[model samples]
Target: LKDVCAPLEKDDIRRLSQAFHRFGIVTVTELIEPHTRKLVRAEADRLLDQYAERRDLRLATTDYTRRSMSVVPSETIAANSELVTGLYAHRELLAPLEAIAGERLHPCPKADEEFLITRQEQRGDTHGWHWGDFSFALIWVLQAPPIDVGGLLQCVPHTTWDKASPQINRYLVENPIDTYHFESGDVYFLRTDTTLHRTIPLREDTTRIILNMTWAGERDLSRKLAADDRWWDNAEVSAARAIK
Candidate 1:
């Protein structure tokens, strides 16, 4: 009920906008009160036992699914404390989240209480590169302790493209435009689809939990493809392919 976000001055808003323009990501320090951060942590702790049971079943200790999704309360019960606290605590974050996303974000309805945790302890070594559909994701470190290290969100500076070429996200990994760590209670708005990204493995016994919420945006193909055509037109076809 109380405002968690401070009233933004014109300069703050401008800097925030500029960050998105320049690097596609920005870190706003102390975006929410410490209390809100604690609220998130407390509730997550409460859910730990139940979460661990589910985590073992849903997430692979050795490998993560290429992707995964889950609604809160485990689809077996109604909502619980974490959902209630997060709704209030995340209020301050919503404005900034929308600022970076360039669209109004709606909380997941069927799954507003949802938590989508992605584990990359395994994928850090493989070099194929990766991307996702979500507009942005909120990362919560549940099982892992924060060590000064990597898996920080990585992305291209400024480039938007459709999924015509499945390999586009992978091609840009060698030249990362930017990277940043997710402070708890911090929401990361990312181009998981457009910006090629991957995380480093935990140097120690690190287990990372991330909450990813996706938002849809407007954009036509910078490179349009034929409706009947395939994304793998390159190796098989030619750049001479007509754009229409």
Candidate 2:
């Protein structure tokens, strides 16, 4: 997951604390200081360039479609890039995040020490509304086309499993959607497992780049998707244990 390399200014801490309380999500602008932002961006540019010839994974379903690169699990990218390594292990970053979450968050065990890079290049490339596998997803906007060109993050907040059902899922699609646009270098956090969220499609000629860090509390809601019914059937035991 992205680390907090620098302590947030008091105002920023206040703003994020309040926003997380109200929305279960918080968008922080210029999350990385300017010099650090430049370094990180430069690294991303290099990696993206290096991997440009790699085949993009074309994923599509009734809910969404996109072309993205293979995920880089935690610690892997850090091994190759200093900036990424720092962000992945930043304590200052995690402190405020822990404050907002009201608990210590850990990197997802499934992809321990790794992160994700997603690209939305075509007009229909997008992520559909769905819960995340982990409890939280920290996102950094490394690149974004104009907001009008799409690739905006959208969500229906506070809609966790306690409020979810087959009926509610359908209704959610028809309900109001909160949308957010981030300038390059912006960062945001989501309680993904509970919040129904999605990415709007990028228009043709537009491209959006994202770096994602996945984290979890004691319970990983994502396990429910494994179809073993463990997340629900073993609620007491499951919630007490970390993802293995």
Candidate 3:
């Protein structure tokens, strides 16, 4: 985790290095400006509301997360046009990521729509240090200002706690990575599986809204792999197909 801190800066870069020095973890943020932030957030919020109305009720937190995350099938929001269009419109932001991975990164239609939204009435307390199989995650800040003062993003650079242990209480939770306050239009990639991370509790009355995507490397999905028949191929319908 610490060795991976090459691209960070300021407080973020320093905190990331600490993770690598003691353990091995680094977190990176991609700064997107304010205007773009407003555009994307407005688009997302609009679609979310549309989905909720179609269901004849407010969208469930988990359900809202699922829809806003990746592409999924719900009679009301399946083949979600607004969300898809918004992403396409912002391809400039995502294009560099594709270049970094050396291949196009397509969102998981089934999973891309899951996201967390914290509002004044609903302060999202969804907290816990967790890990997963994703190679990385992309988070887009939709709404500005964290709703609480304590909702600082924190992470441990390495995964010292072995899930194999029945009583995993002794694992070193030492190296801490804190991504203190972030404004709107911030984007970041977190090494989810290798990093032990959590956020500081919220202390404000505002809402914190961020969109996230959990992804795996996709070299196999490149146009170069089209003939190999090894990637998802027929396994799943490509968004390219929809354009046709």
Candidate 4:
């Protein structure tokens, strides 16, 4: 992807894929240009105000340290900004991700939407440790909180989803964590299906806003759910309904 960022030559993609395969996460610094960065930040600010009434609060779980708000739908923000749309359509970016995943990745289906707006507004607001169902995730920082003031992204890489029992959960809590502090325009990609990750608590008077873009493999869960009626009893299914 040759833009504000350097060219993504074959060697570069190879290296990036290697890192992603080993760690399950990779940070692409300054992935967006200065102008695009400012545009994204502006759009995020406007949407935060526009959808103030639609924001939903999440309570802290034993797995997560604090709670935060899940803001407006991603499509809403994408509809309002051309830069967002262009970035999503950028083929060069998607090419590398496809290479890393070794399969054709598609933007999550319309039923789930591809983008999410997240806000850590209150002091100590956090999105706790959790595993996602997606194969990969891209988080773009719009507004970053102060350094050393919480709002850090913490991840425990190289984890397996099938091992998600109480014992493994405790081991994750006590294990070493890789933490990242992002600035406006910085983006990080993670193989969230296998990586256990979460956000740290926000500090006093600080707020961190991010645009989350998620991609997944070709497996269509909706079709499976349609065939299996009892799948509706799952906690994730119920939690998704409660949010809606």
Candidate 5:
């Protein structure tokens, strides 16, 4: 996070803040600019296989089953590339976040929670319903499928979480799920904790690659230890390895 990158102007910040305040989210395709985005995308592609992971299970904390074809967990990315790692704290991303949140934001203190890449490929790839342990997550879309082919984001904002009993079905039936689709190079900010959300399953083989960078609001920093991310931090599970 340095002075080299340009932050958004006052008027743009004001408009985005209003939208975020209303919907708990905001996004744009040009925030990072094509130059940096292309570089980051290239690095991510280069390192994909080295740290790729697979998972298919319902996480205990959120009662959401993640059926991902691949995931590059946080530490792996951090250890491999400085350019990708520094993105978590870059001012180009955080400056606007501070204003939109109407509160100070910090890079997630938890090492494993800092950043991760989830690539939804295969016919059944999906993130499922879950809420992040932290407050906010800025998702940089490196690739996406067509609008009709799934890989869409579905969210129900201003929802509650009960670890003991998530009642996902109840929430789904009770509230309206807002679906969103993004193209490659788009960056979307999400209020992960309060916004119950997921990436819809792909109907066919396609790509929906995203880098989830977490940020902590004043409230999240204290509660960061409330849950563990071992489900993702530990190595991936596929086939019989994941079966009980």
Candidate 6:
């Protein structure tokens, strides 16, 4: 993490906090050292082929069809990748994020929410629309299609997630959608719980791979929910079990 994330100075912290506060999102340009980013991509590629689960049906938890492959249950990542698991737990890397969040952040208590990889390789592949159970996520882009080819990040910040009745279309109509196109080695932060986001469907056969690390806010630790994730079971049943 020391080498991967450069030291953030005062002005750097200010800009990050400003963007996150105003937009509920921020992009980190200097975080990833070029060679480290390239090296991690090799690991991500290996894991994608070994562990990711492909989804083609509507997820009950999110009410959207996930057309991409997501490496799941986080435990697989913990066991298989030191770089990823190390970064997820490293306190050094959290300083910039904590400053942006304006609060002390905590590691995700749930193992499955900690980290994972999502890859979209086919035409029309997408992660679809959803809010995360946790508060924030660090999305490290390894590969992404050009803006014209789609696979851009589209979200409605400051939106709510209602499991009983998710009025996604209502939110879409009411809010200004933010679309972002990031390049390889770029990193961005998302206010996951409040940002209703998705990767727009690809227009052609393109590859978009991302490693996501999610963390918790003060409120998320105290909030209670009746949310159930049988959708995860639906997605995981077809993938090989991480534990032997």
Query: CA shift at 163, candidate 2, in angstroms?
Result: 14
lDDT of 6 by residue, 21-114 (tens): 7777899767656766776788789888887786565655565536455555477877899888777767767876787788877888777678
Model 3, poorest ten-residue lDDT window?
A: 54-63
Report the poorest 10 consecutive residues by lDDT, candidate 5: 235-244
lDDT leaderboard ranking: 6, 5, 4, 2, 1, 3
The best candidate in terms of lDDT: 6
On residues 84-170, what C-alpha lDDT tens digit does candidate 4 reach at each position?
666666786676667756667776664344667777777656766666656778777888877788888877777754422424466
Q: Model 1, 101-159: lDDT tens per residue?
A: 56666543334223443443432321123444334444444333364645455567555
Evaluated at residue 228, the lDDT of candidate 3 is 17
**Model 6, which residues run further than 4 Å from truth?**
65-67, 70-72, 230-244
Q: Give the C-alpha miss distance for residue 210 in model 1, angstroms.
A: 3.1
TM-score of 2: 0.74
Checking candidate 5 for backbone clashes, the offending pairs are none
Comparing 4 and 5 on TM-score, the stronger one: 5
Instruction: List per-prediction Cα lDDT, in the order shown.
Output: 0.44, 0.61, 0.41, 0.63, 0.76, 0.77
Candidate 3 lDDT tens digits, 1-244: 0121123235654554454444433323433444555665775566556543110111121111111111112223325555534443346545544444334555543342323232221233323344433445566655555434545566655563333331212322344454545666666656554665555444545555565555554522333212211111121222111111
For residue 67, model 5's alpha carbon misses the true position, in angstroms, by 3.0
Q: What stretches of model 4 exceed 4 Å from their correct place? A: 1-5, 53-66, 100-102, 160-168, 171-175, 219-244
Model 6 residue 116 lDDT?
A: 72
**Stretches of model 2 off by over 4 angstroms after superposition:** 1-6, 9-12, 52-78, 161-175, 221-244
TM-score of 1: 0.61
What TM-score goes with each of the models?
Answer: 0.61, 0.74, 0.53, 0.77, 0.89, 0.89
- TM-score ranking, best first: 6, 5, 4, 2, 1, 3
